[PDB]
Amino acid sequence: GSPLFD
């Protein structure tokens, strides 16, 4: 849901 933590 973000480039780093979904």
mmCIF file of all heavy atoms in Angstrom:
data_model
loop_
_atom_site.group_PDB
_atom_site.id
_atom_site.type_symbol
_atom_site.label_atom_id
_atom_site.label_comp_id
_atom_site.label_asym_id
_atom_site.label_seq_id
_atom_site.Cartn_x
_atom_site.Cartn_y
_atom_site.Cartn_z
ATOM 1 N N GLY A 1 0.873 -1.177 0.000
ATOM 2 C CA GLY A 1 0.000 0.000 0.000
ATOM 3 C C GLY A 1 0.908 1.224 0.000
ATOM 4 O O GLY A 1 0.494 2.388 0.134
ATOM 5 N N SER A 2 2.198 0.940 -0.166
ATOM 6 C CA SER A 2 3.237 1.956 -0.240
ATOM 7 C C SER A 2 4.360 1.185 -0.929
ATOM 8 O O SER A 2 4.317 -0.034 -0.904
ATOM 9 C CB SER A 2 3.674 2.360 1.157
ATOM 10 O OG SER A 2 4.257 1.225 1.763
ATOM 11 N N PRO A 3 5.359 1.870 -1.517
ATOM 12 C CA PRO A 3 6.423 1.048 -2.104
ATOM 13 C C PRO A 3 7.209 0.170 -1.117
ATOM 14 O O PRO A 3 7.895 -0.737 -1.520
ATOM 15 C CB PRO A 3 7.384 2.108 -2.693
ATOM 16 C CG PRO A 3 6.556 3.339 -2.875
ATOM 17 C CD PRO A 3 5.608 3.297 -1.730
ATOM 18 N N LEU A 4 7.143 0.456 0.183
ATOM 19 C CA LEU A 4 7.960 -0.252 1.170
ATOM 20 C C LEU A 4 7.257 -1.228 2.136
ATOM 21 O O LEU A 4 7.906 -2.110 2.672
ATOM 22 C CB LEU A 4 8.758 0.780 2.015
ATOM 23 C CG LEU A 4 9.701 1.773 1.274
ATOM 24 C CD1 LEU A 4 10.407 2.700 2.268
ATOM 25 C CD2 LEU A 4 10.749 1.028 0.434
ATOM 26 N N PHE A 5 5.958 -1.093 2.370
ATOM 27 C CA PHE A 5 5.271 -1.950 3.382
ATOM 28 C C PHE A 5 3.840 -2.310 2.984
ATOM 29 O O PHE A 5 2.973 -2.439 3.835
ATOM 30 C CB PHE A 5 5.249 -1.221 4.749
ATOM 31 C CG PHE A 5 4.747 0.196 4.698
ATOM 32 C CD1 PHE A 5 3.345 0.528 4.764
ATOM 33 C CD2 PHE A 5 5.650 1.239 4.574
ATOM 34 C CE1 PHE A 5 2.888 1.863 4.704
ATOM 35 C CE2 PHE A 5 5.209 2.625 4.512
ATOM 36 C CZ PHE A 5 3.824 2.897 4.584
ATOM 37 N N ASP A 6 3.645 -2.448 1.687
ATOM 38 C CA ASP A 6 2.345 -2.793 1.066
ATOM 39 C C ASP A 6 1.331 -1.661 1.153
ATOM 40 O O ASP A 6 0.994 -1.199 2.272
ATOM 41 C CB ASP A 6 1.760 -4.123 1.565
ATOM 42 C CG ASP A 6 2.280 -5.353 0.765
ATOM 43 O OD1 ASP A 6 2.188 -5.351 -0.488
ATOM 44 O OD2 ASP A 6 2.792 -6.300 1.390
#
